[model samples]
Target: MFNALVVDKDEESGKTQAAVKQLSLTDLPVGEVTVAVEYSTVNYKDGLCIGPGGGLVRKYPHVPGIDFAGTVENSSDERYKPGDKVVLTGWRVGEAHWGGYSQKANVRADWLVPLPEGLDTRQAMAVGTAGFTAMLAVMALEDHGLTPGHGPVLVTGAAGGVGSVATAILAHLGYEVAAVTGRPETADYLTSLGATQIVARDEINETVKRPLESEIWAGCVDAVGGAMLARVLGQMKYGASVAAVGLAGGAGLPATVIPFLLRGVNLLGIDSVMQPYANRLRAWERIARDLPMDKLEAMIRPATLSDLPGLGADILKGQVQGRVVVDVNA
Candidate 1:
């Protein structure tokens, strides 16, 4: 028997909750590869899966964890072998299939990526999907000619997982990082991640009253959408771009084309899920090579399977300070 954080729905009431369960190998989902999971990380989607309907997990008695890092226990695929370290993220694993949050995971061979040399299992999960998404955002900006000396780059939801990692990465890349957050108490934490300035959430929460505000951001990595993103559009420097990811604020975008037309501003949408394999590999490689280990260590909040439920709710409420990495075996 192996321990897995299993999410089950009451058949009659359709109530969903998560608990640790001893699962047999025969009970595991059908997959060509089986991994001994060493680490998994909590994500916003995971939080929803363990909390409410999640809208992601369609079935009950499911395992929910979008990210995992571990060694191959067995593989029918020729690409992997026993003891080979691997990592999995995105491609709708946790939402649609059995995920990490377990002593073992059975997954498709295509979903696994060989863990890079610079990162261990725990550290890989520490960076996880959030950090990978951040890297993708930064890369998108860079592809548009954004650079450290261009001006101040803005990071919204700066206290959250993706924001924290974005802030650290932008700083490490030598960009002037401006973090936008709601919590005043998290100012120091953002600063520690190399934020050159912290903008109050109130600054961007409201609708864009003006067609064009002062061009404040050289570029932006926006995790919060809705009015905040609309407001940010008017505040971007000429020819600057915003990497749009996440919709924590809301899905609706209320803004004008003034910034895009007059300033050549671009709003780049990022979807790490279903990302092309080459791009995914590139992002993870960059994370292994460039993401600051010291900063990642500082940002990591360790937890075990038992802590998932409370942690899930807290994260959705915006109470989580940084990345939560779970040691499934602990």
Candidate 2:
């Protein structure tokens, strides 16, 4: 038997609790491929899945991890073979199916990507879904003509997983990074991850009473939406682009279109789930090349299966910093 983090609801109280449970091959979900899951990450989505009314997991006794890396254990399809390395992200695995928070995972062959060269199973999980989204956001900006010489790039929620990875990639690409976060404790941490300037979230979280503000950011990777995003939109340089990747602040975006119409600023929305296969490959390829693993280690906090409950709540409240790697074997 192998171990997995299992989320189950009390039938009478309808309350949920996540615990480590032993699982067998027969207990695994129906799929074309079975993976020996080596590592997974605790993301915002994973946190929700472990909480009450998560909105993502409709079923009880579910596993909660949006992304993982592993070796193929068995496969019914010719595309994958035993001992092949693979990684999975963003196909609603934790929510709709049994996911990676376990010692084994049964998933579709199409849901798995060949582990990119220069990355191991555990390192792949270190990047996980959050880093994947960061890559996509950076790619969106690059597609819109963003370059290193176009002035400093702004990253909101810079202490969180996605923003942390985005900051590293941008700085590695030679762009000056303005990292924004509310936590003063992480100022040095963010700087170590390649942030040239660390800005307080409050400095830019002001509501846009004015339709447009002085142009500041050449581009932005915004993990916090709502008022913070609205304010950033007004501050973007002419013809600049902003990639919206998260809603840790809130989903409601209240602002005028003056930035879009007058300044020609583009607000690009990035979604990791249900992304095209080609795009997925491209994003991973970029992560393998651009994101430095040594820097990634600096942004990482390791957690075990028992840490999920508290980490889950912490992430939603913005109390967690950087990426969290879950070692299933721990």
Candidate 3:
């Protein structure tokens, strides 16, 4: 038996319970490749899956980790062989199928990608889905011709996972980055990650109230949506793009169409889930080349399989700090 963090729902209590349990290869779902999972990381969706249902888990008796990195142990597919390294995210594996919170994971070869060069298994999960999504957002912005020295690129909700990674990469690429958050405590942290300026939500919000403010942002990686997103649109420079990633603020956009009409501003939806294989590969490659590993190393907070239950709860309560990297085999 190998260790895996499993969650089961109580029929009568209506509460979800998670624990590290012994699991066998026979218990894993059918797939072409079986992985010796080296690492997994907790994210907001993982918090939902590990706790009382946020409607993400379709099946009980589940292992819930949205992303992981590992070495291929056995394979029936031609693309991957035993001993190859791999990373996985965003195929709904943690929610719909058994996932990476285990010492072992069986998944479709199509769902796996070769671990990018310059990244080890543990480091891959350190980046996790949040970092992966952040890279994709930057890729989208670059596709829209975003480059350094245009103006300060805005990263709303900058204290969160996606926003923090976005801030780091944009800064490394030589763009002036303005990170937005309400937490004054994280200003130095954000600055250390390469934010040139830290803007409060209220500071940015007051100007966004007007339909069209002076074109301030060259680009933006937006994690907070709803009204905050509505405000940010008015501040983006002409022909600049905004990569809309998360909806932490709210899902609704509560503003006029003036920004899109007048500025040629584009709102590109960034979906890390089920991304095309080509795009996913390039995104990881970009991360390997562009992300500052020193900054990333500083953000890591480590845990083990047994630690996930408490960490999951904390993440749900907004108490978990930094990137919680779970070393499953530990």
Candidate 4:
């Protein structure tokens, strides 16, 4: 038997509870590859899967870890062989399907990517889905002509996983990073990740009468999608783009189209899930090359299967900081 974080729903109460449980290899879903999972990470979706389901978990007695890295133990697919290092993210693995919380995970060969050079299983989990998405957002902005010398770039929800990674990556790329956060205590933490300026949550959390503000941000990676995104849109430099990654603040967009029409501001929607294989490979390669190891190390917090229950709850409340890497064997 191996350990896994399993979430089961009470039939009578319809309530969900997650706990570490012993599971057999036969219990895993059928797939082309069987991975000896070494590390996994908790993501925002993980909180929902581990707690209330959030319409993401369609079955009970589920495993919920959106991302993981491991060594292949068995594989029928020619692309993968036993002992090959692999990483997985997106494709709704932790939601509708069995996921990486277990010591063993069986997944489609197509869902796994060969671990990039310079990254091991632990380091890959440290980046996880959150960091992967952050890289995608940054790439989206760069595709729209954003560059380091353009001006200051904005990272909303800067204390969160996506924001934190985006801040570090953008800063490493030589862009002036303006990190927005509700928690003032994380100012130093954000600075350590390369945020040159701290923009308080209150500064951009409200809806203003003015639809457009003075152009400032050359580009933005916005994890908060409510009023703050609206505020950021108005502040983007002419022809700048904002990659919308999450809805941590709220899902509603209450703003005018003045920024898009008058300023040529672009709001790029970033969806890490269902991304094509080519782009996934590209993003992973970029992450391995551009994201600094020291910076990634600063964002990591170690955890284990037993710690997942509490970590899941904390993540939903936005109390968890940086990335939480789970060592399944620990």
Candidate 5:
């Protein structure tokens, strides 16, 4: 039996409890690839699934890890073989399917991406879904003609996962980065991640009345997509684009199309889940090449199997800092 973080529902109380328990190889759901999961990381969705289910976990006794990196133990398909390193994210594995919270994960071969050169299982999980999607958002911005030196690029949710990685990557690529966050304590940390200016959360997120404010912000990676996004839309430079990755704030955007119609501002939606294989390859390759390791290293915090329950709760409270890389075997 292998150890796995299993979440079981109490049918009587309709409550879920998470624990690290021994699981047989046969207990895993069927798939074409079986991975010996080395590392997994906690995200907000994971916190929700771990604690209250958040309507994301449809089935009981679920394994909740949205992303991981590890080696393949067995594969029915020829694309992967024993000893091959792989990464998995955004196939809804943690929500709709068996996930990487176990010592082993059975998943479709198509869901796995070859771990890029220079990144091990642990480092890849250190980057996790946040970094992976951050790379995607950057690529989208560049594809839409965002280049360095136009103006300061904005990263909303500057201290959060996607925001953090985007700040680092944008800075590394020579762009002047203005980071947005409500947590003032993280100003030093954001500066450490290459944020040149720290904009207060209220400074940006509170702009609800204005549909078109200034021709600033050459590009934006918006993780909080409510009024903040709507406000930022009006603030974007003409012909610039904002990659919408998450809706931490307002999902139903309360705004007008004046930004799009009047200034040609673009709102590019980024979905890491169900991304095409080719773009996944592009994003991973870019992450391997573009993201700085020392900066990435700074974002990592260590954890083990037994620590997940508390870590999950902390993440839900937005109390966890940086990425929490889980050493599953420990």
Candidate 6:
């Protein structure tokens, strides 16, 4: 038997609650590989999954970890073998299937990637899905002709997981990083991660009167959607791109097409889930090569499986800082 964080809905009130519980390998969902999950990380979706289901959790008594890293304990698939290090992300594991909140996880071979060299299981979870998505956004911007010599790159929701990782990688790549954050206190923290300028959340959160503003950023990785994204659209340099990674602000895009038609600005959508294996390998390889270990270490906050209930609530409230890495075996 292994320990897992399980969320169950109260039949009477229809409210969900999460807690750690002992589970057996037989309790896990059907899959070819069984992993000895070492580390997991809390994401925005994890907060919703651990609490009220957020319409993502289709069934009760669900495990709620979107990403994890571990060693394979058993596998029927030839692609993976016992003792091989692997990482799992996306594939709707946390929401629609059994996830990595447990010390043990059974998952399909296709959902696992051989843990990239230069990273251990713990460090892999430190990057987790958030950092992985950040890498994807960076690649999208680069694919659209973004270069360090162009101009400053803006990272919205800069103190959050996706934004933080983007800032670090962009800065490391020689781009001037302008980080947008609501918390002024995190200015030093963001700067420590290589952000050159700190853009206040209020400065970009509001919907401006003009549809097209003076071009400021050459490229962008936006995690806060809604009006913030709408505002960012006007600030992109001509022929530049903005990779939309999240909707922490809201889903609505209240903006005009002037930026696209007049400026030739590209708004690329990044979906970490269902990404092709080739692309996944590309991003992971880039992350291993580009993302600095010290910077990644700065973003980690340690936790255990039992701490997930409170951590989940804290994340939704935006109270958590950086990434929260949970040791399932702890």
Global lDDT of model 4: 0.92
Error of 6 at 299 (Å): 0.7
Cα error, residue 269 of model 5, in Å, equals: 0.6
The lowest-lDDT stretch of 10 consecutive residues in candidate 1 is 51-60
User: Backbone collision count in every prediction?
Assistant: 0, 0, 0, 0, 1, 0
Q: Cα RMSD (Å) per model?
A: 1.1, 1.1, 1.7, 0.9, 1.3, 0.9
Q: In model 1, what are the clashing residue pairs, if there are any? A: none
lDDT of each: 0.90, 0.91, 0.88, 0.92, 0.88, 0.92
Q: Which of the two, 2 or 6, has more lDDT?
A: 6
What TM-score number comes out for model 2?
Answer: 0.98
Model 1 TM-score is 0.98
After superposing candidate 5 on the true structure, give the runs of residues whose Cα lies further than 4 Å from its correct spot. Answer: none
Selected candidate, larger lDDT, 1 vs 3: 1
User: Per-residue CA lDDT of candidate 3, range 1-330, in tens?
Assistant: 899999999978878889989989999998999999999999878988999768888888899998999999999999999999999998998999999899999999999999999988888988999999999999999999998988999999887778778888999999999999887888998999999999998776533446998889999999877788888898889999999997767667787889999999999999998998898999999999999889888778899998988988887655654688899988
Which ten residues in a row are the worst by lDDT in model 5? Answer: 203-212
Extract clashing residue pairs from model 3: none
- The sequence of per-residue lDDT tens digits that candidate 1 reaches over residues 137-157 is 999999999987878999999
Residue 44 in model 6: shift from native, Å? 0.7
- Cα RMSD, model 1: 1.1
How much does candidate 3 score in TM-score?
0.95
